[PDB]
């Protein structure tokens, strides 16, 4: 009901303040509703944009409110503000400030508590929660920010080093590309099931364009085009074999004569061997995102390879049909060249 006073009376009068509200009305909406500010009254208070009474609860005496009580879904307050940003210019405006605010204050009282580390039960850091939910503006913010102040720099993310007259430079932290340990922001916006249309734009400017532009310059463009031309010669050798196969019915059975014979049965093994490769790469994809069309192009390599493989087994059951399979796989592979453009 947004009342500084009766709030002040009850807490002068011993309200308990770690008291959770966890009816289905607070967790995600049946639709019952609803809604989710994450339970804890301080999370309720900061999330209700009551800067004064989130200040009251924490500076007060009868019980200053504890700041790291993760709620039932493990969302801390900072986890709760990020669940409530909605990428309206003014919604970002007050939550980005209310969040700026709790951290400047956690620095004041309890500087030891590294608080943007506190994970929810699902292990996310509050940033990893913004970015996994396409909250493009808090993510523009936790990454962009530097408070200038005393005890500021424990607070801050991205420090500015020299402003020449036209320009700036900067030094960004970064936790994210190098949180390879747990949930990188990039790992999180890079899956990118992107079923929130809010996701794609948000691989854009603050710490992360300039950096993935920079991985790609340095080592991984170079690795990609090696990883590309190896597929092309896989494709030529797999044409080359399929294209100089026999007619003699029941194949092979056996082959020795002279040279072309030698060169081809090499191309027939070199092909299935790359078939089982993709079948194998594709189960490992299917298993790392065991389970998830988010990845169309992940699929059709697998479907090709399974056609390399229901060919190979048929070449040995001595069904004459095995070609029909291998001809599809071959039509597929040349089509699977298409993806390896992404993005010229």
């Amino acid at each position: 009901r947004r009342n500084m006073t009766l709030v002040t009376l009850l807490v002068e009068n011993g309200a308990d303040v770690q008291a959770a509200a966890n009816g289905d009305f607070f967790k995600k909406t049946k639709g019952r509703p609803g809604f989710y500010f994450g339970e804890l009254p301080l999370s309720l208070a900061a999330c209700t944009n009551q800067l004064a009474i989130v200040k009251f609860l924490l500076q007060n005496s009868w019980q200053p409110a504890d700041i790291s009580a993760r709620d039932s879904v493990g969302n801390t307050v900072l986890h709760a503000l990020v669940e409530v940003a909605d990428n309206t210019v003014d919604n970002t405006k007050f939550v980005t400030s209310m969040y700026n605010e709790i951290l400047i204050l956690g620095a004041k009282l309890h500087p030891t508590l590294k608080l943007e580390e506190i994970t929810n039960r699902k292990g996310l850091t509050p940033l990893a929660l913004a970015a996994s939910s396409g909250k493009i503006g808090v993510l523009a913010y936790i990454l962009q920010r530097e408070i200038h102040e005393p005890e500021c720099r424990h607070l801050s993310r991205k420090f500015t080093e020299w402003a020449y007259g036209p320009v700036h430079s900067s030094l960004y932290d970064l936790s994210c590309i190098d949180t390879c340990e747990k949930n990188s922001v990039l790992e999180v916006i890079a899956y990118s099931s992107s079923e929130t249309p809010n996701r794609h734009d948000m691989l854009l400017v603050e710490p992360l364009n300039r950096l993935l532009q920079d991985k790609w310059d340095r080592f991984v463009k170079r690795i990609f085009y090696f990883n590309f031309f190896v597929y092309c010669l896989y494709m030529i050798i797999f044409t080359a074999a399929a294209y100089y196969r026999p007619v003699e019915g029941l194949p092979p059975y056996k082959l020795k004569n002279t040279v072309g014979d030698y060169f081809r049965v090499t191309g027939e093994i070199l092909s299935v061997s790359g078939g089982v490769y993709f079948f194998f790469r594709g189960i490992q994809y299917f298993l790392q995102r065991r389970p998830s069309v988010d990845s169309y192009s992940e699929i059709l390599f697998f479907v090709q390879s399974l056609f390399m493989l229901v060919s190979v087994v048929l070449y040995f059951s001595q069904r004459k049909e095995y070609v029909a399979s291998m001809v599809f796989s071959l039509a597929m592979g040349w089509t699977n060249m298409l993806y390896y453009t992404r993005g010229f």
Partner: peptide, 20 residues
Amino acid sequence: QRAITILDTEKSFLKCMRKA
């Protein structure tokens, strides 16, 4: 999509010396 080909081709390249 450059970035998905990136975020993986290092994850599938043994977690090695790169800026980090």
